[PDB]
Amino acid sequence: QNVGTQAAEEPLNLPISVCTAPGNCQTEADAVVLDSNWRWAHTTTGYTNCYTGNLWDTTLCPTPETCTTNCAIDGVPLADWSGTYGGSVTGNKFNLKFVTVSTNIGARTFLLDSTKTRYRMFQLLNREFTYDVDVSSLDCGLNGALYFVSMDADGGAAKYPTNKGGAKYGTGYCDAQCPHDVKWINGLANSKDWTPIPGDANSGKGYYGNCCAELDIWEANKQSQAFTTHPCTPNDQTRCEGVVCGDNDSGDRYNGMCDKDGCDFASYRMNDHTFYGPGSTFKLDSTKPFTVVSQFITTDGTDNGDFKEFRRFYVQNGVRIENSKVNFPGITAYDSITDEMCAATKGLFGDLDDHKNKGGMKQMGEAMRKGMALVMSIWDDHDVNMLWLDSNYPPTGNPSTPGVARGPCPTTSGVPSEVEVTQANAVVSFGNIKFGPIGSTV
C-alpha cells in the first residue's frame, strides 16, 4: 500500500520491561500500531474511499495492481485511538475496547520497537515472556488474544516495494490460519475476487491468504483459555492461493502449509474444568487480573538448542499457580506443550497431528529463533462463533468424548451480531509486559 497524507500516524507509547534477574529490569520504550486492515483506504491524490463497508470500489480497483496504484492507507492520530478504535494506554497497561461507536468492531495491534519504524522482534527460545491481563469483561463468544507471528520486522517493505508504510502502518499481517480477510498482502491490495463475509458489515475475503508460523500465548475470555503452537512449512510470511492456504471451505484444512489446529494446551479441554473460571473458588479467578508467565525451554538450555517445551504458570494476588494438567485415564498428566503431549492428546481426541507433519516443536522453535512480532487483539468469530475455544466443538459432539468440550459456554453462544450488542463494552487489558531469561520476570 501507498501511504496517505490525510492523517499522521501516531502509535500509542507502551513501555515494557527487559529483565536480567528477578526484580532487576529496565524499561524499553516501545509502542503499539494498528493493523492496516483497520485503516481508511482512499485515493492517493484525494478523499475518495477505495474500500467502504465490506467492498472495494470496482472503478478504482478493477485489478489489484490498479487498486494499489490508485489507493493509499492513512494514519491513526492520537485522538482517534480511543475515539474511533477503542485503544488506550495508561502507564504500562494497554486497553482494547471491543466495540467503539463510525462503529468499529474488534482490533488487532502490533508492538513497535523504540524507533517506531520496525516491529519489536522477540527471539523467544530459552526466554520467558510475561504480562498481566484482565479478561473479566469478556464472556462467551469473545477472545482477547496475545500471540506471536512470523511477520517481517518491516512488514514486508524490503520484499515488496509497493508497501510504502511497512511496520509503521501495521502492514504484513500473516498467521497460521492463512487468512484471506487481510486487505493488503505482498504490498498489493488483496482485491481480486473479493467477497463480503455475510453478516460482517466490515470484512471480506480476497483471492490470496497470508501464511506464517504462530505462537499463541493467550486465546481467552473469562470462561476458557488456551495456549497453542502453530508451525508452518516454511515458517516465514508466505502469500498463498489454492491448496497451499489450507482453506476450510474447500476441505483443505490439513492440506496447506500451516498447522491450523495447532497443538493446544487448554485447561478445560484437557479435562480440568475447575482450574480457570469467573469466581473466587476456581484456582485462577478470571474476574480479577492475573499474571501469565510463559517459558520456552530448549533441548540444551541454550539459545542454540531446539524448542522442546512451552511451560506455563500464573501469579494472582501474589499467589503462584502452576499450570493445570491433562486429566484422562491412561494419559500422562502433562502440564506443558511438548511433541509427546501433542501426539498423546491428539491420539486420544482423534485429531490429525498436523503439528507433527509440519515439523513439530523443532519447527515452531525455528520461527521463534528468527524472531516473531507481538500481536494484541480483541475479536469475535464469524466462522465458528468461538465454540472451538469455549464450548463444545463440534457443537453436535458428545461433551463426554475427550476433545469435544472446551468450555461451559452454550453452543448457541458467540453469534457475532449478538455478542456485538451484549458485549459492546468488553475491554481486554494487557500490561506490565516483561521479557528476559527463564526465572527473571517475577
Short mmCIF file of all heavy atoms in Angstrom, two decimals, residues 216-266:
data_model
loop_
_atom_site.label_atom_id
_atom_site.label_comp_id
_atom_site.label_asym_id
_atom_site.label_seq_id
_atom_site.Cartn_x
_atom_site.Cartn_y
_atom_site.Cartn_z
N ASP A 216 0.60 -18.97 19.97
CA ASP A 216 -0.49 -18.37 20.73
C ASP A 216 -0.18 -18.47 22.21
O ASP A 216 -0.21 -19.56 22.80
CB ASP A 216 -1.82 -19.04 20.41
CG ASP A 216 -2.24 -18.85 18.96
OD1 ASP A 216 -1.93 -17.78 18.38
OD2 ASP A 216 -2.90 -19.75 18.41
N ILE A 217 0.13 -17.33 22.81
CA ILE A 217 0.35 -17.26 24.25
C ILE A 217 -0.99 -17.32 24.98
O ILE A 217 -1.10 -17.92 26.07
CB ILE A 217 1.09 -15.96 24.64
CG1 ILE A 217 2.41 -15.81 23.85
CG2 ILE A 217 1.35 -15.89 26.14
CD1 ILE A 217 3.39 -16.95 23.99
N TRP A 218 -2.00 -16.70 24.39
CA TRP A 218 -3.23 -16.40 25.11
C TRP A 218 -4.40 -16.23 24.13
O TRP A 218 -4.47 -15.25 23.41
CB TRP A 218 -3.01 -15.14 25.94
CG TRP A 218 -4.10 -14.81 26.90
CD1 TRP A 218 -4.98 -13.77 26.82
CD2 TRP A 218 -4.44 -15.52 28.10
NE1 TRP A 218 -5.84 -13.78 27.88
CE2 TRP A 218 -5.54 -14.85 28.69
CE3 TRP A 218 -3.93 -16.67 28.73
CZ2 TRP A 218 -6.14 -15.29 29.86
CZ3 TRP A 218 -4.53 -17.11 29.91
CH2 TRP A 218 -5.63 -16.43 30.45
N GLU A 219 -5.26 -17.24 24.08
CA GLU A 219 -6.55 -17.17 23.41
C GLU A 219 -7.55 -17.36 24.53
O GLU A 219 -7.56 -18.42 25.18
CB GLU A 219 -6.69 -18.30 22.39
CG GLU A 219 -5.60 -18.33 21.32
CD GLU A 219 -5.79 -17.33 20.21
OE1 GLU A 219 -6.94 -16.91 19.94
OE2 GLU A 219 -4.77 -16.98 19.57
N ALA A 220 -8.37 -16.35 24.81
CA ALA A 220 -9.13 -16.38 26.06
C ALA A 220 -10.28 -15.42 26.20
O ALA A 220 -10.31 -14.33 25.63
CB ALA A 220 -8.19 -16.17 27.24
N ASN A 221 -11.23 -15.86 27.03
CA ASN A 221 -12.17 -14.97 27.68
C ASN A 221 -12.24 -15.42 29.15
O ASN A 221 -11.39 -16.20 29.61
CB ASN A 221 -13.53 -14.98 26.95
CG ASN A 221 -14.09 -16.37 26.75
OD1 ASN A 221 -14.13 -17.17 27.69
ND2 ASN A 221 -14.53 -16.65 25.52
N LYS A 222 -13.22 -14.93 29.91
CA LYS A 222 -13.34 -15.29 31.32
C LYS A 222 -13.74 -16.77 31.55
O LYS A 222 -13.58 -17.27 32.67
CB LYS A 222 -14.29 -14.34 32.06
CG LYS A 222 -15.78 -14.65 31.93
CD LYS A 222 -16.61 -13.49 32.42
CE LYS A 222 -18.02 -13.91 32.76
NZ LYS A 222 -18.84 -12.73 33.16
N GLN A 223 -14.24 -17.46 30.51
CA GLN A 223 -14.71 -18.85 30.64
C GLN A 223 -13.67 -19.93 30.33
O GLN A 223 -13.65 -20.97 31.00
CB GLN A 223 -15.94 -19.07 29.77
CG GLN A 223 -17.07 -18.07 30.01
CD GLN A 223 -17.76 -18.23 31.36
OE1 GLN A 223 -17.44 -19.12 32.14
NE2 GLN A 223 -18.73 -17.35 31.63
N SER A 224 -12.84 -19.68 29.32
CA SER A 224 -11.82 -20.61 28.86
C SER A 224 -10.59 -19.89 28.33
O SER A 224 -10.69 -18.78 27.79
CB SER A 224 -12.35 -21.49 27.72
OG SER A 224 -13.42 -22.30 28.14
N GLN A 225 -9.45 -20.55 28.44
CA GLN A 225 -8.18 -20.05 27.90
C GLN A 225 -7.33 -21.18 27.33
O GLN A 225 -7.43 -22.33 27.77
CB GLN A 225 -7.42 -19.23 28.94
CG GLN A 225 -7.24 -19.90 30.31
CD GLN A 225 -6.21 -21.02 30.31
OE1 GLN A 225 -5.23 -21.00 29.58
NE2 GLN A 225 -6.47 -22.02 31.13
N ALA A 226 -6.49 -20.84 26.36
CA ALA A 226 -5.61 -21.81 25.71
C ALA A 226 -4.32 -21.16 25.29
O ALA A 226 -4.26 -19.94 25.07
CB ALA A 226 -6.29 -22.41 24.48
N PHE A 227 -3.29 -21.98 25.20
CA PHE A 227 -2.03 -21.63 24.55
C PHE A 227 -1.67 -22.74 23.59
O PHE A 227 -1.95 -23.91 23.86
CB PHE A 227 -0.91 -21.26 25.53
CG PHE A 227 -0.50 -22.35 26.52
CD1 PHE A 227 0.67 -23.07 26.33
CD2 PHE A 227 -1.22 -22.55 27.71
CE1 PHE A 227 1.10 -24.03 27.26
CE2 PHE A 227 -0.80 -23.50 28.63
CZ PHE A 227 0.35 -24.23 28.42
N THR A 228 -1.11 -22.35 22.44
CA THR A 228 -1.07 -23.20 21.26
C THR A 228 0.11 -22.87 20.34
O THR A 228 0.41 -21.70 20.09
CB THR A 228 -2.38 -23.02 20.45
OG1 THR A 228 -3.49 -23.11 21.35
CG2 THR A 228 -2.51 -24.06 19.34
N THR A 229 0.76 -23.91 19.82
CA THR A 229 1.84 -23.78 18.86
C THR A 229 1.31 -24.10 17.47
O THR A 229 0.60 -25.09 17.31
CB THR A 229 3.02 -24.71 19.21
OG1 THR A 229 2.54 -26.05 19.41
CG2 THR A 229 3.75 -24.24 20.46
N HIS A 230 1.65 -23.27 16.48
CA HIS A 230 1.29 -23.49 15.08
C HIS A 230 2.53 -23.34 14.17
O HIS A 230 2.79 -22.25 13.65
CB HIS A 230 0.27 -22.47 14.58
CG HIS A 230 -1.03 -22.43 15.32
ND1 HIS A 230 -2.16 -23.08 14.88
CD2 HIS A 230 -1.41 -21.72 16.41
CE1 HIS A 230 -3.17 -22.80 15.69
NE2 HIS A 230 -2.75 -21.97 16.62
N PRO A 231 3.28 -24.43 13.95
CA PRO A 231 4.33 -24.33 12.94
C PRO A 231 3.77 -24.36 11.51
O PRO A 231 2.66 -24.84 11.28
CB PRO A 231 5.18 -25.57 13.20
CG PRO A 231 4.22 -26.56 13.78
CD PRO A 231 3.25 -25.75 14.59
N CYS A 232 4.54 -23.82 10.56
CA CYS A 232 4.24 -23.90 9.13
C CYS A 232 5.50 -24.32 8.39
O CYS A 232 6.60 -24.18 8.92
CB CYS A 232 3.78 -22.54 8.60
SG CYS A 232 2.37 -21.81 9.47
N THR A 233 5.33 -24.82 7.17
CA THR A 233 6.47 -25.19 6.31
C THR A 233 6.38 -24.43 5.00
O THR A 233 5.55 -24.78 4.17
CB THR A 233 6.48 -26.71 6.02
OG1 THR A 233 5.21 -27.11 5.51
CG2 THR A 233 6.78 -27.49 7.27
N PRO A 234 7.15 -23.36 4.80
CA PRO A 234 8.08 -22.77 5.78
C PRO A 234 7.36 -21.91 6.81
O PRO A 234 6.16 -21.70 6.72
CB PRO A 234 8.98 -21.91 4.89
CG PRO A 234 8.06 -21.43 3.81
CD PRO A 234 7.10 -22.56 3.55
N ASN A 235 8.11 -21.39 7.78
CA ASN A 235 7.54 -20.56 8.86
C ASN A 235 7.29 -19.10 8.45
O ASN A 235 6.42 -18.44 9.02
CB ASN A 235 8.47 -20.53 10.07
CG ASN A 235 8.42 -21.80 10.90
OD1 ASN A 235 7.34 -22.34 11.17
ND2 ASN A 235 9.58 -22.24 11.35
N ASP A 236 8.09 -18.59 7.52
CA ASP A 236 8.06 -17.16 7.17
C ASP A 236 6.83 -16.76 6.35
O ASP A 236 6.15 -17.61 5.76
CB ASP A 236 9.35 -16.70 6.48
CG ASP A 236 9.68 -17.50 5.26
OD1 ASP A 236 10.14 -18.65 5.43
OD2 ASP A 236 9.49 -16.99 4.14
N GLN A 237 6.56 -15.46 6.34
CA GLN A 237 5.40 -14.89 5.64
C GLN A 237 5.35 -15.38 4.19
O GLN A 237 6.30 -15.21 3.43
CB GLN A 237 5.44 -13.36 5.70
CG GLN A 237 4.31 -12.67 4.92
CD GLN A 237 4.67 -12.42 3.47
OE1 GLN A 237 5.74 -11.89 3.16
NE2 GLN A 237 3.77 -12.80 2.57
N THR A 238 4.23 -16.01 3.84
CA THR A 238 4.06 -16.63 2.54
C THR A 238 2.63 -16.35 2.05
O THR A 238 1.66 -16.83 2.65
CB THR A 238 4.29 -18.15 2.64
OG1 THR A 238 5.60 -18.39 3.16
CG2 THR A 238 4.16 -18.82 1.28
N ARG A 239 2.51 -15.57 0.99
CA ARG A 239 1.23 -15.40 0.32
C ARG A 239 0.84 -16.73 -0.32
O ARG A 239 1.66 -17.38 -0.98
CB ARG A 239 1.29 -14.31 -0.73
CG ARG A 239 -0.09 -13.99 -1.33
CD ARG A 239 0.02 -12.89 -2.36
NE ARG A 239 0.70 -13.34 -3.57
CZ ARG A 239 0.83 -12.64 -4.69
NH1 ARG A 239 0.32 -11.41 -4.79
NH2 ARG A 239 1.48 -13.18 -5.72
N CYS A 240 -0.42 -17.12 -0.12
CA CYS A 240 -0.90 -18.40 -0.61
C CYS A 240 -2.11 -18.24 -1.52
O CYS A 240 -2.83 -17.25 -1.43
CB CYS A 240 -1.24 -19.31 0.58
SG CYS A 240 -2.67 -18.75 1.55
N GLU A 241 -2.30 -19.21 -2.40
CA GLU A 241 -3.54 -19.39 -3.14
C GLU A 241 -3.74 -20.89 -3.30
O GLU A 241 -2.80 -21.66 -3.12
CB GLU A 241 -3.49 -18.73 -4.52
CG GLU A 241 -2.39 -19.28 -5.42
CD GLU A 241 -2.41 -18.66 -6.80
OE1 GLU A 241 -3.27 -19.06 -7.61
OE2 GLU A 241 -1.56 -17.79 -7.07
N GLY A 242 -4.96 -21.29 -3.64
CA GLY A 242 -5.28 -22.70 -3.84
C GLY A 242 -5.07 -23.52 -2.58
O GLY A 242 -5.28 -23.04 -1.46
N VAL A 243 -4.60 -24.75 -2.77
CA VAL A 243 -4.45 -25.73 -1.69
C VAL A 243 -3.45 -25.31 -0.60
O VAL A 243 -3.61 -25.70 0.55
CB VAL A 243 -4.09 -27.13 -2.26
CG1 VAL A 243 -2.65 -27.18 -2.77
CG2 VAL A 243 -4.32 -28.22 -1.22
N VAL A 244 -2.44 -24.51 -0.96
CA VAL A 244 -1.40 -24.09 -0.01
C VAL A 244 -1.97 -23.34 1.20
O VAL A 244 -1.44 -23.47 2.30
CB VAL A 244 -0.29 -23.26 -0.72
CG1 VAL A 244 0.72 -22.66 0.27
CG2 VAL A 244 0.44 -24.14 -1.74
N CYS A 245 -3.04 -22.57 0.99
CA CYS A 245 -3.70 -21.86 2.09
C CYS A 245 -4.36 -22.78 3.10
O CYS A 245 -4.62 -22.38 4.23
CB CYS A 245 -4.78 -20.91 1.57
SG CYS A 245 -4.23 -19.56 0.51
N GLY A 246 -4.68 -24.00 2.69
CA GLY A 246 -5.40 -24.94 3.53
C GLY A 246 -6.77 -24.43 3.92
O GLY A 246 -7.15 -24.49 5.09
N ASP A 247 -7.52 -23.93 2.92
CA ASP A 247 -8.84 -23.33 3.17
C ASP A 247 -9.82 -24.33 3.76
O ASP A 247 -9.97 -25.45 3.25
CB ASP A 247 -9.43 -22.74 1.88
CG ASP A 247 -8.63 -21.57 1.33
OD1 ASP A 247 -7.85 -20.96 2.09
OD2 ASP A 247 -8.76 -21.26 0.14
N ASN A 248 -10.51 -23.91 4.81
CA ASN A 248 -11.57 -24.71 5.43
C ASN A 248 -12.70 -25.04 4.46
O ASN A 248 -13.19 -26.16 4.44
CB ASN A 248 -12.16 -23.97 6.63
CG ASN A 248 -11.17 -23.84 7.76
OD1 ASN A 248 -10.52 -24.82 8.14
ND2 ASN A 248 -11.06 -22.65 8.31
N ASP A 249 -13.09 -24.05 3.66
CA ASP A 249 -14.27 -24.17 2.79
C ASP A 249 -14.14 -25.17 1.64
O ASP A 249 -15.15 -25.67 1.16
CB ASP A 249 -14.66 -22.81 2.22
CG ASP A 249 -15.10 -21.83 3.29
OD1 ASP A 249 -15.34 -22.24 4.45
OD2 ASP A 249 -15.20 -20.62 2.97
N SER A 250 -12.91 -25.45 1.20
CA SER A 250 -12.66 -26.44 0.15
C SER A 250 -12.18 -27.80 0.69
O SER A 250 -11.68 -28.62 -0.08
CB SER A 250 -11.66 -25.86 -0.85
OG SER A 250 -10.46 -25.49 -0.22
N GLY A 251 -12.35 -28.06 1.99
CA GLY A 251 -11.90 -29.31 2.60
C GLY A 251 -10.39 -29.45 2.71
O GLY A 251 -9.87 -30.57 2.81
N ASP A 252 -9.67 -28.33 2.70
CA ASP A 252 -8.21 -28.33 2.65
C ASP A 252 -7.54 -27.97 3.97
O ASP A 252 -6.33 -27.74 3.98
CB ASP A 252 -7.73 -27.39 1.54
CG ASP A 252 -8.01 -27.92 0.16
OD1 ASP A 252 -7.86 -29.14 -0.07
OD2 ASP A 252 -8.35 -27.10 -0.72
N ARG A 253 -8.28 -27.97 5.08
CA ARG A 253 -7.71 -27.58 6.38
C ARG A 253 -6.36 -28.24 6.71
O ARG A 253 -5.48 -27.59 7.28
CB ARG A 253 -8.69 -27.86 7.53
CG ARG A 253 -8.26 -27.26 8.87
CD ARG A 253 -9.33 -27.45 9.95
NE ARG A 253 -8.89 -26.89 11.22
CZ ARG A 253 -8.91 -25.59 11.55
NH1 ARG A 253 -9.36 -24.66 10.71
NH2 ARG A 253 -8.44 -25.22 12.75
N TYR A 254 -6.21 -29.51 6.33
CA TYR A 254 -5.00 -30.29 6.59
C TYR A 254 -4.12 -30.52 5.36
O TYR A 254 -3.21 -31.36 5.40
CB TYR A 254 -5.39 -31.63 7.22
CG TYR A 254 -6.18 -31.42 8.49
CD1 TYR A 254 -7.56 -31.62 8.52
CD2 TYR A 254 -5.55 -30.95 9.64
CE1 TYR A 254 -8.28 -31.39 9.68
CE2 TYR A 254 -6.26 -30.72 10.80
CZ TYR A 254 -7.63 -30.94 10.82
OH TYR A 254 -8.33 -30.71 11.97
N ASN A 255 -4.35 -29.77 4.29
CA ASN A 255 -3.59 -29.91 3.04
C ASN A 255 -2.67 -28.73 2.74
O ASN A 255 -1.96 -28.75 1.74
CB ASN A 255 -4.56 -30.11 1.87
CG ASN A 255 -5.32 -31.42 1.96
OD1 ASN A 255 -4.82 -32.40 2.50
ND2 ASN A 255 -6.53 -31.43 1.44
N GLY A 256 -2.69 -27.71 3.60
CA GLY A 256 -1.96 -26.49 3.35
C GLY A 256 -0.61 -26.50 4.03
O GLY A 256 -0.17 -27.52 4.58
N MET A 257 0.04 -25.35 3.99
CA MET A 257 1.40 -25.19 4.50
C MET A 257 1.48 -24.98 6.02
O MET A 257 2.55 -25.16 6.60
CB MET A 257 2.12 -24.05 3.77
CG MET A 257 1.55 -22.64 3.97
SD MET A 257 2.67 -21.41 3.28
CE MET A 257 3.86 -21.22 4.62
N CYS A 258 0.36 -24.59 6.65
CA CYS A 258 0.33 -24.31 8.10
C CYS A 258 -0.49 -25.34 8.87
O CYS A 258 -1.46 -25.91 8.34
CB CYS A 258 -0.23 -22.91 8.37
SG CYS A 258 0.95 -21.58 8.03
N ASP A 259 -0.08 -25.57 10.11
CA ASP A 259 -0.83 -26.37 11.07
C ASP A 259 -1.93 -25.49 11.68
O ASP A 259 -1.70 -24.73 12.64
CB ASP A 259 0.12 -26.89 12.16
CG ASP A 259 -0.60 -27.52 13.34
OD1 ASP A 259 -1.77 -27.95 13.20
OD2 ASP A 259 0.02 -27.56 14.41
N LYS A 260 -3.13 -25.58 11.11
CA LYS A 260 -4.25 -24.72 11.52
C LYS A 260 -4.80 -25.00 12.92
O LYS A 260 -5.13 -24.06 13.63
CB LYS A 260 -5.39 -24.79 10.51
CG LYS A 260 -5.10 -23.99 9.26
CD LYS A 260 -6.28 -23.84 8.34
CE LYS A 260 -5.82 -22.81 7.31
NZ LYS A 260 -6.89 -22.19 6.54
N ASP A 261 -4.95 -26.27 13.29
CA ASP A 261 -5.42 -26.60 14.65
C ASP A 261 -4.40 -26.15 15.67
O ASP A 261 -4.76 -25.61 16.73
CB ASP A 261 -5.66 -28.11 14.83
CG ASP A 261 -6.84 -28.63 14.06
OD1 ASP A 261 -7.64 -27.83 13.55
OD2 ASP A 261 -6.96 -29.88 13.96
N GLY A 262 -3.13 -26.38 15.36
CA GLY A 262 -2.06 -26.16 16.31
C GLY A 262 -2.06 -27.26 17.36
O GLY A 262 -3.00 -28.06 17.43
N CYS A 263 -1.01 -27.30 18.17
CA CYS A 263 -1.02 -28.15 19.36
C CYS A 263 -1.36 -27.27 20.55
O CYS A 263 -0.57 -26.41 20.94
CB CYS A 263 0.30 -28.86 19.58
SG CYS A 263 0.25 -29.89 21.06
N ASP A 264 -2.55 -27.48 21.10
CA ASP A 264 -3.10 -26.66 22.17
C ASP A 264 -2.96 -27.31 23.53
O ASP A 264 -3.09 -28.54 23.66
CB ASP A 264 -4.58 -26.33 21.92
CG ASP A 264 -5.43 -27.58 21.75
OD1 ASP A 264 -5.12 -28.39 20.84
OD2 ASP A 264 -6.41 -27.75 22.51
N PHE A 265 -2.67 -26.49 24.53
CA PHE A 265 -2.94 -26.81 25.91
C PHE A 265 -4.01 -25.83 26.39
O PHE A 265 -3.74 -24.64 26.57
CB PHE A 265 -1.69 -26.72 26.79
CG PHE A 265 -1.84 -27.41 28.10
CD1 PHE A 265 -1.24 -28.63 28.34
CD2 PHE A 265 -2.64 -26.86 29.11
CE1 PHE A 265 -1.40 -29.29 29.55
CE2 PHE A 265 -2.82 -27.52 30.31
CZ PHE A 265 -2.21 -28.74 30.52
N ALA A 266 -5.23 -26.35 26.56
CA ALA A 266 -6.39 -25.60 27.03
C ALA A 266 -6.93 -26.35 28.23
O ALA A 266 -7.44 -27.46 28.07
CB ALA A 266 -7.45 -25.49 25.93
#
